[PDB]
């Protein structure tokens, strides 16, 4: 699709057998989602860095469908004010900024 | 241009008679820039909201050039970890997400 930016670019995603919504965020390096139960291995990762750090669980090579596009990428799972699709997964779906 | 997202989408901007760099950030509603001296009227605005609020100066209808596109929009001026072009100015330049 071509998504204009008059509203927040929120899309539907399928992850870990659940339907969720997340924000396509070109300002975020990484993808961070809350309340998903993923199978398979993880390691803790420290993110943010303002006021302290936030610890999340890093899952690598996670299958995820983003607005109909089935891809694979790292997903960080933990508390986040908004579910965020970062650049790491936007590259996978072939998402570009155009003007 | 068409900008792929393997790296941070940092572009050159002209504002307040200065050349600066800023991040095209679809996760940000507003544009926030540090160390610019804009002429004309402003009002304080509270932004963020995590850990407290941050107070910035809101300047309306500011002429700004973003990657060669001369537009007009609101610019918040205050210390920010990275200069950010928000959706408010990405709409002005006709920037879309495409995949």
């Amino acid at each position: 699709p071509q998504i204009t930016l008059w509203q927040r670019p929120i899309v539907t995603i399928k992850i870990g057998g659940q339907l969720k919504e997340a924000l396509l965020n070109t300002g975020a390096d990484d993808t961070v989602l809350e309340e998903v139960n993923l199978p398979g291995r993880w390691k803790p990762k420290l993110i943010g860095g303002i006021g302290g750090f936030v610890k999340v669980r890093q899952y690598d090579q996670v299958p995820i469908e983003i607005c109909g596009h089935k891809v694979i990428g790292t997903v960080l799972v933990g508390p986040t004010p908004a579910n965020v699709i970062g650049r790491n997964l936007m590259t996978q779906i072939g998402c570009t900024l155009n003007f | 241009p068409q900008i792929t997202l393997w790296q941070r989408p940092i572009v050159t901007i002209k504002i307040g008679g200065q050349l600066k760099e800023a991040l095209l950030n679809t996760g940000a509603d507003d544009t926030v820039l540090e160390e610019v001296n804009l002429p004309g009227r402003w009002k304080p605005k509270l932004i963020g909201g995590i850990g407290g609020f941050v107070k910035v100066r809101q300047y309306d209808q500011v002429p700004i050039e973003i990657c060669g596109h001369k537009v007009i929009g609101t610019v918040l001026v205050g210390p920010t970890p990275a200069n950010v072009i928000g959706r408010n100015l990405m709409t002005q330049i006709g920037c879309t997400l495409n995949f």
Partner: peptide
């Protein structure tokens, strides 16, 4: 809200 982010 306003949303840049690096670990």
């Amino acid at each position: 809200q306003n949303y840049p982010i690096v670990q």
